[PDB]
Amino acid sequence: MTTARDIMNAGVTCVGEHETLTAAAQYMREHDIGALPICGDDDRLHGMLTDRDIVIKGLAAGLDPNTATAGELARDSIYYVDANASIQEMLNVMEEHQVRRVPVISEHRLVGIVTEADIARHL
Amino acid sequence: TTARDIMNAGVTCVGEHETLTAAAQYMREHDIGALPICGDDDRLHGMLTDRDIVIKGLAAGLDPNTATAGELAIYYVDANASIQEMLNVMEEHQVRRVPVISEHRLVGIVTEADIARHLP
Ligand SMILES: [Zn+2]
Ligand SMILES: [Zn+2]
């Protein structure tokens, strides 16, 4: 049986929860990415932060990008699948949260990221 | 079918002198990821996306309460443009949103999804 572990992009960097929104923006530019998994110490997943979140939940909400943190916003977007999750389970989570990307966890730690495109390649 | 038939007419246009924070608020308000930027009398100056604010704004060290949409700001179609013509512009600029102009003024916005839902 195919699992998230089989399909995921293993070993991605999880940005620190205390990083400011400005630092997260710099990170998104530096690494040409728009969705970041945010973690507490030891890669403990706290949620996902997108470029749009910074604008909508950050700037649009009157938050200061130089003081508000990635963790404060990512906590509003917590969802994931276990490394042993099936393709159907991953699709169910994506559907429920209206996203095409989902973090993969194993023993409370982020171990990878799975996208619909990844699933598509493993059918 | 023309752009005028498919567009969301009279959508908000962020003024060139409005700040990035103001633009962000419009994006939340209308739940959209891109807004046309206008000079006087609805004259189109360009488009601003949410990622633009993050990458060309915050990542560049600019203050969103100071920097304006105009400073981060070209493509569009006439209101009589065909679907084929609209798709050409979207493919050339690699975008899913396009400003519609008529008599030198912005009159609306057309999205790729708009075209899809308007096809019989
Ligand atoms: Zn219509
Ligand atoms: Zn062009």
UniProtKB/Swiss-Prot annotation, chain A:
Keywords: CBS domain, Disulfide bond, Metal-binding, Repeat, Secreted, Zinc. Residues 8-65, 73-123 form the CBS domain. CDD domains: CBS_pair_HRP1_like. Signal peptide: none annotated. InterPro entries: CBS_dom (IPR000644), CBS_dom_sf (IPR046342), Diverse_CBS-Domain (IPR051257). Zn(2+) 2 binds at residue 122. Disulfide bonds join 14-39. It comes from the Bacteria. It is found in: Secreted. Coiled coil: none annotated. Induction: A member of the dormancy regulon. Induced in response to reduced oxygen tension (hypoxia) and low levels of nitric oxide (NO). This is Hypoxic response protein 1. It comes from Mycobacterium tuberculosis (strain CDC 1551 / Oshkosh).
